[PDB]
Amino acid sequence: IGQEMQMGDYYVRQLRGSAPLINDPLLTQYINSLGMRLVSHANSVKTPFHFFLINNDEINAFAFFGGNVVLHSALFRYSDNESQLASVMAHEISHVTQRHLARAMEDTWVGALGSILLAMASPSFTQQNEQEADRIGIQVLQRSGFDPQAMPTFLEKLLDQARYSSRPPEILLTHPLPESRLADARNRANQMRPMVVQSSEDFYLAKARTLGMYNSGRNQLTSDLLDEWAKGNVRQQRAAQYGRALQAMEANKYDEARKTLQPLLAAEPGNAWYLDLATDIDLGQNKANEAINRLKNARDLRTNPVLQLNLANAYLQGGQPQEAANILNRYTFNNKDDSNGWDLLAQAEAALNNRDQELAARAEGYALAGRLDQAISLLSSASSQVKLGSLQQARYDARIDQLRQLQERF
């Protein structure tokens, strides 16, 4: 487990630099708050878990060392309910806890494998591992309070689209599904108790933002899906109203987006989804003060990362880079693996013409993207602009030392 936490970091750093990862706070927070909810109900967990979202309209999901589960945004277009989406995550979670890929290789090497995981994200197991991944998957899926029949329903809807479409989805290549696999999935969900679970409000909002803001190819949020959601339950109707407000924002129709979002923010002034969108609309119309005052009146400002990055950007476009830096210095210290915070920090330090601090912030973004040589180059320039023996020299040079360890390792 010692090495595979480390090879996980090397592989996800490569994923950041090459694959089109969705770095959105609201979506990343959702996929990881949901995914961690199942890990807490999973057995034999050796590692922390992180869940990544790729902008890819091809449906696929996979996982590797260090509890890193990779999910394509296409999973939101296929998932009718939240339990189906978590059904695939528990499928992936069980692949890690059982260490399936670990043993496939215990029976030159790491770069040949890394090209495989990377090519899958950018636009296979034998069925003995896949039966077991279903085995443990639904127990976890049911002790997580989800619908156990969501897996046979979701597996079956992959099969219905593999005959009624030319070539099958890519998920069925890494996770093949014969009729035996379905019949087992269909039986064991039959064997446990019926559950009536409503999909969380965050699932429908996350689907809308995924298909609305990160549209690409078959990943569209179409009028047919929004009109259908206008008839659905109370949670789907707010998400369709949010989806219309989102797309009115995307199309630069800011005043309509404000009036469309108004009934949802008036009903829930402290919801982070509506606060995020209301900041985009205000910033789109050069009213940063309104976007600043609204987020300072948010209850969860100092506890919610989405609100912290949102108000930092609002401070940035509002001409107060120092206020942005105060948030972003604390944000990057508590969320050191978040590339959004380091980037906004680099923008803030650049606005203050703190050149060494700007280069130091840029370096973290490059290190997160697997560009360690270039991160070292920026920190070397930073170190060369400050007196030797200064605290900034020692800091920049020590950071260079730590990144050289990661490069000497591979």
Q: By CB under 5 A, tell whether 130 contacts Zn ion.
A: yes
- How many whole angstroms separate alpha carbon 110 and alpha carbon 181? 31
Decide if 77 contacts 60 (C-beta within 8 A).
Answer: no
Decide if 67 contacts 98 (C-beta within 8 A).
Answer: no
Residue 120 contacts which entry, Zn ion, a second copy, none (Cβ below 5-8 A, type-dependent) = none
Question: Nearest-CA neighbor of 409 among 364, 375, 372, 362?
Answer: 372
95 is in an annotated binding site: yes
72 is in an annotated binding site: no
Give the nearer residue to a second copy in terms of CB position, either 146 or 274: 274
Active-site pick, 58, 92, 343, 364:
92
- How many whole angstroms separate alpha carbon 46 and alpha carbon 57? 31
Q: Least distance from C-beta 71 to Zn ion, angstroms?
A: 13
Q: By CB under 8 A, tell whether 251 contacts a second copy.
A: yes
* Site track for a second copy across 378-407, x = CB under 8 A: x-xx-xx--xx--x---x-x--x---x---
202 as an active site residue: the answer is: no
Region of residue 353 (phi > 0: left; psi between -120 and 50: alpha; otherwise: beta): left
Q: By CB under 8 A, tell whether 343 contacts a second copy.
A: yes
Q: By CB under 8 A, tell whether 296 contacts a second copy.
A: no
Q: Least distance from C-beta 125 to Zn ion, angstroms?
A: 5
397 as an active site residue: the answer is: no
Q: By CB under 5 A, tell whether 343 contacts Zn ion.
A: no
Decide if 272 contacts 300 (C-beta within 8 A).
Answer: yes
Decide if 317 contacts 288 (C-beta within 8 A).
Answer: yes
- How many whole angstroms separate alpha carbon 342 and alpha carbon 334? 11
Other beta carbons less than 10 A from residue 302's beta carbon: 11
- How many whole angstroms separate alpha carbon 94 and alpha carbon 269? 38
Decide if 86 contacts 79 (C-beta within 8 A).
Answer: no
Among 43, 124, 286, 289, binds a second copy (CB under 8 A): 286
Q: Known binding site: residues? A: 91, 95, 130
Interface positions with Zn ion (CB under 5 A): 130, 133, 175
Interface positions with a second copy (CB under 8 A): 231, 234, 250-256, 259-260, 267, 286, 322, 325-327, 329-330, 333, 343, 346-347, 359, 362, 365, 371, 373-374, 376-378, 380-381, 383-384, 387-388, 391, 395, 397, 400, 404
Q: Known binding site for Zn(2+): residues? A: 91, 95, 130
Write out the catalytic residue numbers: 92, 134
